[PDB]
């Protein structure tokens, strides 16, 4: 017999990402900074490294879309689903999609892209939702208001159980 | 924290299904009986339970379609592809589609709906194809006036355990 094997984690520590397109809501620079910071959340506590490609195929393809956007997991207009990411693997695996019917922001006027991305990249790297209400991987968006972010121990332990410490 | 499971499986033992529409070829009752019996093949050897929903969103959405029918796997008219099902997951995950350009039957004529469905639900639950020519999960259709072969028993129990063994 055969089962459908899940890639519990990336086989390699060096991963690439590409920002395929950009939301109207923020400047290119703000979007770039948010995603770079979101990846750094996870690379700061593991041996994972992330490099940005501008062209061609990358491990983690990032894009903004609405409704049906090419994977038959359609978004739903404003509210509800904000974004989704595929677990580690080839092709769509690792990819992260953001619903552009949401308002994305570098601050608090809408959904903070950095925070949502950091959460979604968790999925991209092999983490499921946490039951710890304080964890980044807890399935509820919140915005602290503070200009610095500390990855909670629950997420540190989860990601390091897959990849080890930095 | 939680990491993603080792292989594609349902995280719950109680699953729902919905027969979204019906083939012209068989009565409603015949179709319901075939699907009910196909689920029992798997519930009989695991702790899984299946409950039918008449409307709304079920884990395993069942439908008959032709050609393009809402996914990346268009059917192809008579012969060739008969059916397909998606591995456990959200949305289209677990769903099973049957090509209604085929003749579906509750006999040895045409394609026996029970047998094809029993195979497709294997996929819905996380089994891929087996190399065992006599396995239910063998990819090529064959007709039998059922007992689940051991290869399939071992596969499905590797995912969900045996349930009540006697
Ligand atoms: C609905 C999916 O869940 C998130 O998108 C999500 C964002 C987020 C931010 C924090 C935080 N500000 O620490 C904690 C948990 C979080 N979950
Ligand atoms: C979509 C094509 O349907 C199958 O792939 C398929 C049905 C089937 C029935 C038996 C059996 N007679 O038990 C064995 C193997 C089988 N494979
Ligand atoms: Ca990818
Ligand atoms: Ca939405
Ligand atoms: Ca927007
Ligand atoms: Ca066909
Ligand atoms: Ca489904
Ligand atoms: Ca037909
Ligand atoms: Zn998507
Ligand atoms: Zn999430
Ligand atoms: Zn289909
Ligand atoms: Zn198959």
Swiss-Prot record, chain A:
Residues reported to bind Ca(2+) 3: 76-77, 79, 81, 99, 102
Tissue-by-tissue expression: Detected in fetal cartilage and calvaria, in chondrocytes of hypertrophic cartilage in vertebrae and in the dorsal end of ribs undergoing ossification, as well as in osteoblasts and periosteal cells below the inner periosteal region of ossified ribs. Detected in chondrocytes from in joint cartilage that have been treated with TNF and IL1B, but not in untreated chondrocytes. Detected in T lymphocytes. Detected in breast carcinoma tissue.
Active-site feature positions: 120
List of residues binding Ca(2+) 1: 25, 100, 102
Top-rank taxon, per record: Eukaryota
PTM section of the record: The proenzyme is activated by removal of the propeptide; this cleavage can be effected by other matrix metalloproteinases, such as MMP2, MMP3 and MMP14 and may involve several cleavage steps. Cleavage can also be autocatalytic, after partial maturation by another protease or after treatment with 4-aminophenylmercuric acetate (APMA) (in vitro).
Stretches the record annotates as Interaction with TIMP2: 73-143
Positions that bind Zn(2+) 1: 69, 71, 84, 97
Protein location: Secreted, Extracellular space, Extracellular matrix; Secreted
Binding site for Ca(2+) 2: 59, 91, 93, 95
Binding site for Zn(2+) 2: 119, 123, 129, 137
Subunit field text: Monomer. Interacts with TIMP1, TIMP2 and TIMP3. Binds (via the C-terminal region) to collagen.
Associated clinical condition: Spondyloepimetaphyseal dysplasia, Missouri type: A bone disease characterized by moderate to severe metaphyseal changes, mild epiphyseal involvement, rhizomelic shortening of the lower limbs with bowing of the femora and/or tibiae, coxa vara, genu varum and pear-shaped vertebrae in childhood. Epimetaphyseal changes improve with age. Metaphyseal anadysplasia 1: A bone development disorder characterized by skeletal anomalies that resolve spontaneously with age. Clinical characteristics are evident from the first months of life and include slight shortness of stature and a mild varus deformity of the legs. Patients attain a normal stature in adolescence and show improvement or complete resolution of varus deformity of the legs and rhizomelic micromelia.
Free-text comment about domains: The conserved cysteine present in the cysteine-switch motif binds the catalytic zinc ion, thus inhibiting the enzyme. The dissociation of the cysteine from the zinc ion upon the activation-peptide release activates the enzyme.
Protein name, entry field: Collagenase 3
Organism: Homo sapiens (Human)
Residues of the full protein shown: 104 to 269 of 471
